Structures are given as structure tokens and as C-alpha cells.
Design a protein around this nucleic acid. Sequence first.
RNA 1: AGGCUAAAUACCGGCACGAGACCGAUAGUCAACAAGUACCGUAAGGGAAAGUUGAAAAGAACUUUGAAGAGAGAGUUCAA
RNA 2: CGGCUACCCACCCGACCCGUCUUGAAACACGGACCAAGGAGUCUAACACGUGCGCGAGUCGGGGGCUCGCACGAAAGCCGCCGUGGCGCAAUGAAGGUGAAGGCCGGCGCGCUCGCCGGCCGAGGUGGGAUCCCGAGGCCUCUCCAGUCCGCCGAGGGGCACCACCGGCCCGUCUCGCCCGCCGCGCCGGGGAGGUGGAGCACGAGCGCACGUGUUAGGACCCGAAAGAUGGUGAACUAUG
RNA 3: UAUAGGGGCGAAAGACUAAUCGAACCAUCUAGUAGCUGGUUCCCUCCGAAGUUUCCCUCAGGAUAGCUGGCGCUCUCGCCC
RNA 4: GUAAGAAGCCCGGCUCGCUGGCGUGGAGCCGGGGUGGAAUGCGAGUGCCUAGUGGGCCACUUUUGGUAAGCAGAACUGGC
Lengths: 51, 103, 187, 68, 52, 147
Amino acid sequence: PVRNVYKKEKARVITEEEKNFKAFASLRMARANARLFGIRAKRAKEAAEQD
Amino acid sequence: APSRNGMVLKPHFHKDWQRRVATWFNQPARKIRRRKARQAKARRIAPRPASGPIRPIVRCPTVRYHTKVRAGRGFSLEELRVAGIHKKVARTIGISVDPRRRN
Amino acid sequence: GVDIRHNKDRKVRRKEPKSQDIYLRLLVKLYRFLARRTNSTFNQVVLKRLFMSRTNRPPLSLSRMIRKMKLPGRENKTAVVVGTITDDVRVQEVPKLKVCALRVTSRARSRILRAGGKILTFDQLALDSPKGCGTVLLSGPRKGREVYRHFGKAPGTPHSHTKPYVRSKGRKFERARGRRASRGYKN
Amino acid sequence: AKSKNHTTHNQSRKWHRNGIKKPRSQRYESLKGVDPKFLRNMRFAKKHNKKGLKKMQANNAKAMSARA
Amino acid sequence: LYGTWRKAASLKSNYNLPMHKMINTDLSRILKSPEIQRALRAPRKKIHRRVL
Amino acid sequence: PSRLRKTRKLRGHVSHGHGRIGKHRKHPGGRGNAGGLHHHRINFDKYHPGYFGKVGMKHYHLKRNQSFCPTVNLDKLWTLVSEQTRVNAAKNKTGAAPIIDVVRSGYYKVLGKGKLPKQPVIVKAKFFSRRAEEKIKSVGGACVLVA
RNA sequence: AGGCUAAAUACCGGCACGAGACCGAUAGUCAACAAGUACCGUAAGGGAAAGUUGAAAAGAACUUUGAAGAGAGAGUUCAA
RNA sequence: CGGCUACCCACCCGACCCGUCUUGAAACACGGACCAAGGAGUCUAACACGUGCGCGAGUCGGGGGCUCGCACGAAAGCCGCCGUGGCGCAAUGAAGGUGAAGGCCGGCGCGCUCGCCGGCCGAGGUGGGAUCCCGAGGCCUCUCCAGUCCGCCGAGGGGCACCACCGGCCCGUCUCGCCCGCCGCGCCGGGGAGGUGGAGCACGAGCGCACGUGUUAGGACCCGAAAGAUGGUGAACUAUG
RNA sequence: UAUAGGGGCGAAAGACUAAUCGAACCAUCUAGUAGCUGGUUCCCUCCGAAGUUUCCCUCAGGAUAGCUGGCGCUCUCGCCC
RNA sequence: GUAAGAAGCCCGGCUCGCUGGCGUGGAGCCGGGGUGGAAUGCGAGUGCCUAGUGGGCCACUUUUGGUAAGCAGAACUGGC
Ligand SMILES: [Mg+2]
Ligand SMILES: [Mg+2]
Ligand SMILES: [Mg+2]
Ligand SMILES: [Mg+2]
Ligand SMILES: [Mg+2]
Ligand SMILES: [Mg+2]
Ligand SMILES: [Mg+2]
Ligand SMILES: [Mg+2]
Ligand SMILES: [Mg+2]
Ligand SMILES: [Mg+2]
Ligand SMILES: [Mg+2]
Ligand SMILES: [Mg+2]
Ligand SMILES: [Mg+2]
Ligand SMILES: [Mg+2]
Ligand SMILES: [Mg+2]
Ligand SMILES: [Mg+2]
Ligand SMILES: [Mg+2]
Ligand SMILES: [Mg+2]
Ligand SMILES: [Mg+2]
Ligand SMILES: [Mg+2]
Ligand SMILES: [Mg+2]
Ligand SMILES: [Mg+2]
Ligand SMILES: [Mg+2]
Ligand SMILES: [Mg+2]
Ligand SMILES: [Mg+2]
Ligand SMILES: [Mg+2]
Ligand SMILES: [Mg+2]
Ligand SMILES: [Mg+2]
Ligand SMILES: [Mg+2]
Ligand SMILES: [Mg+2]
Ligand SMILES: [Mg+2]
Ligand SMILES: [Mg+2]
Ligand SMILES: [Mg+2]
Ligand SMILES: [Mg+2]
Ligand SMILES: [Mg+2]
Ligand SMILES: [Mg+2]
Ligand SMILES: [Mg+2]
Ligand SMILES: [Mg+2]
Ligand SMILES: [Mg+2]
Ligand SMILES: [Mg+2]
Ligand SMILES: [Mg+2]
Ligand SMILES: [Mg+2]
């Protein structure tokens, strides 16, 4: 019952601007967004509250 | 008591460890017992296969082992209902059934 | 007595190899004969390195054994190692160089034979070069051993950079008094 | 129970049992412990030596080898 | 069950025959070969004992 | 081997390798790590500095199971897949590139080293160092985040 | 906040069983033997020493000194 | 006839009775009447270092499984889609986390204490450094000529290992200024130049077994106490009703 | 016949409590621990000390440095310097 | 305590964000030229692991307290 699946997906050509789009900064942006998600929502609620 | 440049050692031998020393001198004994247990099962019990019931494809819960795969316990009653057979009828057919496993 | 000087009778040396390897004893016999009969200081140093121990003959690596041949003047010379030459997982291109070593590993022998090089042993090295002409005698990273990184004048007093012994490299193991200036002193 | 307090007898002999050593080997003396303004002089001088010494020193070596 | 130095063992999984330390190991043949005796000093068999 | 043990050789000497004056009796200093601050500080300090005190936060119920990320270097980045694969995939055929998936090899984070040749590859991983990301962009490969 | 349930697991007591790079009668269990016996302490309890004739008793008939113990001859045995 | 010798005796000279505590023992210091047997540095776990072997960026099945029921077989052999796992290949931080390649050439933005584009080299440099390479030169019985021949070397070069120094890279803090990108333009991320702290990188040397020494914990080289706790047995002696 | 162990009993000596009493006896923990006495088992060869610095409720002890041994490694002379 | 050389002298040039009338100073780097540079003796350097020691005493000399001591305490060297 192991059946270690081998999804190969070998032959492909390097493509368009995804190679210039998937840089390191996506992980740091996602980390900062996860750390500062709710506090921005609190400041948006306060900006809607304080008129 | 200490000495030159060596690692600080804290062995857990202050408790009376001399009474409870379980040394595996019966390790080939247990091996022969369990061989004869499996062989006596495969002889006398049934022409059912050894390690009888069929186990599921199951992913391991971690950030560590979840890429890998595992033989689980049972076939997760919604899965068994989609397969379309009764519970104990499946247990007597040879299907391993776990009522806890969700989907 | 007579000699007012101190007595240091035996100097330091290891004459007979402590290993009981029969093949190593035969190589010791052959290169002892060549070292005392050829006036070849190459054979002198190879005989001393055969006398030398297991730890003090460190394993050569394939990239270092390439780079010491890549220098100008080592075109057709043979790289002679008293010790083992192992595989390197790093490099990708292997030249057409000639190797004379003891106990080359399996993947290293396979990649040298695929690249076209010629591996030898010390008996064929002696049959091809009695005086050792056309050879470059190499050695490996002795100081790179993990045991040598615990060695120094101290583990911590002028900060010493010399790796004290501990079980687990992490928090709560030897990091408070003498490792930072907020808890007591700082080295 | 009074004991002997302090002496330096049989000490210089133990010192000279092993041959009192000068450190005796410092070629290219150690550079730490020197003025940081002088270090801001010397390190920037070294890295601009690494950058911009090539063509003038090369032509000067060619000139002195041609004149020598 | 063990193989040669060309192929592996087909019954065992990851075993090869070990690499020999000396390929041609006849020490008398090596010491009587012309390539070795071309490059020797001289057989020096004088004794030069103690002179009273 | 008691015949190679020192004890059989020292039979005949009176004090048996431990002196007539000093008299090693039972435990002259203590037991184990006795006197870590009082009378053995020149051995606990000067050989194990940092041994006494608290150092930081106390993560209750810490597992070595959530922080699991085995790092792979760019030297190791090629040999997770065989050399036949990269040679027959980048032997002047086209602008294609083989994919080296480190998650199948068992490594999560790709770190940066040297020795990354001209032939570009696509690396699928969960984490990247920006050094290795710049090395892959310099050799012309791609960088794919998977999970 | 009610309940049952075999398996793998443990066993220096007991019933039979097999093996040992172990000890060989001051050793090995305290105990190779009428050993938890003799014996000691009011009692709780403590606790020993002690193996070997010969192949087979064929254990020395008979004479003689002595009241006997014990001898001197003789005899059995490969050898008293 | 010769004969040293664990036989005895004599003679000349020297010679206090051993073991240990001690600065000092023949001591008016202690133990020893004599003899036979027993009698004291072991074993386990952990660590460190050295040595020996196998494999070597890997290594190890000690946990189980497979073989027909074999005395030695409680052995040995095999697993490989049994490598889960231990150690090592990555460190630095209290942590969120981050995490080790740089250099050259040509063009350009004011080569401006400044960034971009293409190509090339690749773990940097200096001083030492076994070994190795090129080689001036002269050297072999009476004339030029030659090839290995007898036969070294002035001087020069690439430089193993390792040592000293300089430089570079990573991580945490410290100072100073400018720039870049947007799965969405923000108390967002990333970058630069110097100064420090690290048990780091700067072509990796570990894993397993065995042996030796030392240390630690366990009765721990052997023998030794005044003491404490738990549970029971005694007023047949004596004390008092 | 009653009082049984930190209990009894005492015209009081801390006396008696089964030859033991300023805390009975037997067994177990227990081979309690000891920086303190005594002892520590075959031969030959080679090298061979210290009673001193600093610290400790340290002063009969230990840690550190020093003195010492063992294992090697890197080199050098061996053919006017 | 220091010096009695090839790790030293001398010449020529590049760099500096240090310094600054000045190509001024100072450091670093590169290239080149000459080793016969006091006496005597010696083959040197270096890494790891560790036992014992941690009660001392005596003597010439220099000395502190004490009347003095085979008394107590220091210095150099030698010895037990
Ligand atoms: Mg000690
Ligand atoms: Mg206990
Ligand atoms: Mg003499
Ligand atoms: Mg003293
Ligand atoms: Mg001795
Ligand atoms: Mg001691
Ligand atoms: Mg329930
Ligand atoms: Mg229940
Ligand atoms: Mg059960
Ligand atoms: Mg007997
Ligand atoms: Mg007995
Ligand atoms: Mg019989
Ligand atoms: Mg009668
Ligand atoms: Mg007989
Ligand atoms: Mg003494
Ligand atoms: Mg005395
Ligand atoms: Mg006496
Ligand atoms: Mg006596
Ligand atoms: Mg005996
Ligand atoms: Mg080792
Ligand atoms: Mg794994
Ligand atoms: Mg006792
Ligand atoms: Mg108490
Ligand atoms: Mg009770
Ligand atoms: Mg009565
Ligand atoms: Mg009364
Ligand atoms: Mg009590
Ligand atoms: Mg009484
Ligand atoms: Mg009392
Ligand atoms: Mg009591
Ligand atoms: Mg004991
Ligand atoms: Mg001597
Ligand atoms: Mg104090
Ligand atoms: Mg003291
Ligand atoms: Mg004493
Ligand atoms: Mg010490
Ligand atoms: Mg020594
Ligand atoms: Mg010792
Ligand atoms: Mg003492
Ligand atoms: Mg005195
Ligand atoms: Mg005195
Ligand atoms: Mg004397």
C-alpha cells in the first residue's frame, strides 16, 4: 500500500515573465502580510470609525 | 572529581537501576515464538492472506512527513458508503473499517 | 654520570608501521628498498607517509586533486597520494589526469575511468618511476578534522574561537555566564 | 598546625628544565590593536590597490625592463 | 552471488568486490625487473669494521 | 582484554599507580559536578563558559517537528537527479530545462553556494535564500514555490 | 461523570525440560553428605563443619604375646 | 680426573628487620609466632583522545521481517519500495527569522567616496614551505661526428600539507546615507559603506566496529564506624501498681 | 496479671527495662557515607618529579598553572658557503 | 631589557575616503640590485592525552622576630 507516486513533468521550456516574477520577495511579502493582517484591519476599522 | 577539557556529564544512574535491567537474552526466543505464531496463523486460521485486512492510502500529519504516505487503519465510512457495501459485510469481506477517519 | 645533558633517547619516530596490513607491509618493504637504494627523496617521503598513521593520512578529495593539477607546470605529471582519493559531489567536469593512490573509492574510480584517466597502485608507480620522476606528491586537509577544532590555548578566555564540548548546540547549553555581558562577565 | 607559607625556592630550576622561550616567530606582525582611523586609511588603500593598480604598474614594469 | 570487478553482485543488493591494494604483487619479480635495477646506486657490500 | 589491561602489569607495585602520599580513597572532591560555583570554578569556567544562568525565552511544548527544514546547497542541487538526466536534457537540444524537485528528494529550503554551471534548471521548493535565487536568475533558470 | 473485550508485553515463586568460553568441596546456593540439620537465644531470629578404600570386601582365616587397646607372623589384591 | 652448583663447615671483609606514614625509621613509631588455601583497580552506561580495520559525503541494521523441522543454529546469511531513524554534510540569533562566490574585461549614466548591459575566469593574495619540472656548464685512453651510456648542477619555475598576516562571504546587534519592486503602494519588503560579537564559510571527513589511557555515575580497588529510617520480639533479670 | 522503645517504670542514681540503657534486641534499607587509618599480588628495559602561583567555610582536601611521561607530525646536515 | 642582517639596506613607481600650503607627511602594494656581516657550543619547531605533586628539610652567602635554639619566617644556588 505504499505506491510512492512519481509525477515527473520533465520536458518543458523556460517561459515568460513568471521567471522575472517569482522572486524571493514573495515569501517576505507573504510573511509580513501574515504578521500584519489583523492590525491593518483594526486600523481600517478605526479609520472608518473616527470619521 | 572533574578533570581536563571534557564534556560536562550528567548520567541518570543515581536511581537503583541494578534491579530493573531487562537485557534481551530472549530476543531470538521471541523471534522464534513470533515466527511460529505467524506460521501457525497462516496454517490453521484461514486461506486468508497474512496481514489480513486491506489498509488505506493515508498521508502523515506534520509539516515533516506529509509529503510521504502510509498504510492507515480503516476505510473511513463515507468512503466505504461510496464504495457501496455494508459495514460488517465489509469487515467479513476483508475490508478494514475505521469509523473515526473523516474525509 | 657523564652526560650532564638530559636524556631524550628515542626521538619521536615511528619506524615500523603499526598496521598489520600485509599489502601495506609489502609496500613498506618495496619503498624502503627504493628509499635506501635510489637516493630519491620522493621515495623517502612516500616511505615516511607509508609509516604514517591512519588519521594523519587524510582522504584527498577529487576537486582538490584536480585543482593542484590545474596549476601551470602540471600537464602530464601523475598525482601521487599516500592515502585515499574520494569522490566529490561538487564538480561536473573531470580532466584526463593520471592518479597513483591507495584505496580510491568506487565512484571516484568510475568517474575517472569514464573521463579517461588512468588510476594506478604503488607497485605500478614503482615500475613506472623508480626515482619518482614526473610525479606530484599531494596531501590532504589535516587541520579540517572536527577533532582539531576543539584544540587551542583555551576554549573561551580571549574568546579563543575554539568550540567547547557540549551535547546540543543550541539555547540553554553553555550560553549565559561568560558568553554574554548581561549575565556576569563576557570572556 | 602551622605550615610553610610561601617560597620561590626550586622555581627557576623548574623554569629552566624546559628552556624559557621567546615567542621568536612573528613575521608580518598582527594588525589588531591599531588606531581605527589608520585602519580606515589602510583598508581603503588596499582595496583601491586591488582595483586600480594594473595598467600604470604594468607599463612601468615594461619601461624599467626595457631600460634595464 | 558476488560478481567480478566489472559487474556487481546480482543476488546481493549493493556489494562489489573490494579493490586490491597491489595489482601485480610479485615482489621478487618487481625487484628483479630491469626498470628498478636500472635506477639503483651500487651494491655496497663492504663491512668497514672497527680499527684498533 | 584483561591481559592487555594495565592492572595485570601493575601487580607488584605497592600503591598501584595512584601514589603513596595522595591516597585516592573514595571521592576526594565530590561526586559528578560537585562544586560548580564554589571550589571547581577554574574547571567549570575556563573550560565550559556559559554554564550557569538563564539565557532567553521558554517555549512551552517545543517540538523538533514544526521547524523541519533540511537545507540543500547549490552544490548538492544537481546530484539529487542523475547526471545522465542533465546531460541528455541539456546536450544542445533546445531551450528546455529539467526540473529538480527537492521536495521529492527530501529537502525543503534551497540555500546559496557557488558552482552553478551555465545550463539552466527549474527548482521547485518551499523556501529559498535570495543568494540562490540570484544564482538561478544569473544562470538563467526559474524559481518555483510549491507546498 | 455507565460497562465488557483475546493478541503483541512481564515472570529471581511453582511443575516438568534443554544448554553453558561459569565454579569444582576454604570455590559454587547456607546446604554435593540424615541442611534450614546439629547447635545457640525466652523469643523475634541466628546457623555450621562435614565428599573420595578397592575393579570386586576379596574388610585380613589361622598361630602366637597381652585382660583388652595394640602388635609379630601368615593371607587377599597389580599394589596394604 | 674434572665439576659450577638450593648440601655442610671454616676463614677475611662488609653487613641493624621487613611493609608504610613521614623532611627523617633499625628505631624506645605501628602490623607481623609459624605454615597451607582464599584475598584487593572488575563490570555496565556516557564522554574525550590516540591507534587498527571497513565504507567513504555519506555511514550504520543494534528494531523487525525472510530461509525446511537440524547438535554446534540464542550462531551465521539476506532485506533496499524495510534508511523510519542516529551522527555528519550549516551556521548564527532569546526569538520572529535569516543563512556562506567572488573577481576580470568592454560599453554607458557627471568612473561621480555611483548603478546598468554582454562576455570570460573561478574558492583570493603575500612570506615561508617536503616533493616535482626546465636547464647554463663541464665529465668518461690516442683524431671531427653522433645516440641512452659514467655523471652531477649554478640559476629559474609551478608550488602538497601546515604556520603567520592581509582581504572576501554568512548570522545578531551598532553608525551613516541613498535606491529598487509590488496578487496591491503600507508604522510593505529587499539592498549599500564601515566597526564589532559567533563554537561559522573560505572544496567538505564523517559513520560503524575494535583496542589502549583518563574522567564521571553506579556497592566502583578491598575493609572499617558514632548515626538515621521501616517492621516486629521481650516485665523468666530488674523498676512499679 | 498490667505498663514495650524516644516508649515503659523510677522514695530520682539518666538508675532499671533478660550479662547491653545519656535511648534494648532481631531483621531489612545496607556492600549507608567518609577529605580519615591499614593493605593492594610476575620479571626486565627506558624516561622520570613536586611540596610552588591563583581560587574555594579553603588549612589532613580539591580545581588551575608549573614540574613529568606517552603518542606522533613538520623540517634540516649527511658532496666560498 | 635591547641590537649584533637577506624577515636586512638602497632605488623607481601606483593607492589612500588617514593627514594636509605643497607629488606635504605617513602606511599599504608592485618591480629591481648586491647574503663573506661578533666569540663558543648545539640539529630545531610544533600538536594531542595524562599520572603523580599540592606536609618538606639542610648547607655557603644576603637577611626578619627572638637572649638564644637542632626555634619560626624570606632570597640565589646546590644537596637530602
Ligand atoms: Mg587526578
Ligand atoms: Mg540506592
Ligand atoms: Mg657512565
Ligand atoms: Mg604548604
Ligand atoms: Mg615504580
Ligand atoms: Mg588526590
Ligand atoms: Mg466509557
Ligand atoms: Mg469505560
Ligand atoms: Mg495479554
Ligand atoms: Mg580438596
Ligand atoms: Mg561450601
Ligand atoms: Mg567402586
Ligand atoms: Mg589372645
Ligand atoms: Mg603402586
Ligand atoms: Mg615522601
Ligand atoms: Mg613527625
Ligand atoms: Mg615496630
Ligand atoms: Mg605486634
Ligand atoms: Mg594464594
Ligand atoms: Mg579514533
Ligand atoms: Mg531520513
Ligand atoms: Mg559499613
Ligand atoms: Mg539526620
Ligand atoms: Mg513499630
Ligand atoms: Mg516476674
Ligand atoms: Mg522502685
Ligand atoms: Mg527516633
Ligand atoms: Mg542490664
Ligand atoms: Mg548517649
Ligand atoms: Mg533509635
Ligand atoms: Mg566497599
Ligand atoms: Mg635518567
Ligand atoms: Mg574567599
Ligand atoms: Mg593549604
Ligand atoms: Mg595522613
Ligand atoms: Mg594538573
Ligand atoms: Mg615529553
Ligand atoms: Mg595515575
Ligand atoms: Mg598531603
Ligand atoms: Mg626554618
Ligand atoms: Mg617546624
Ligand atoms: Mg646527594
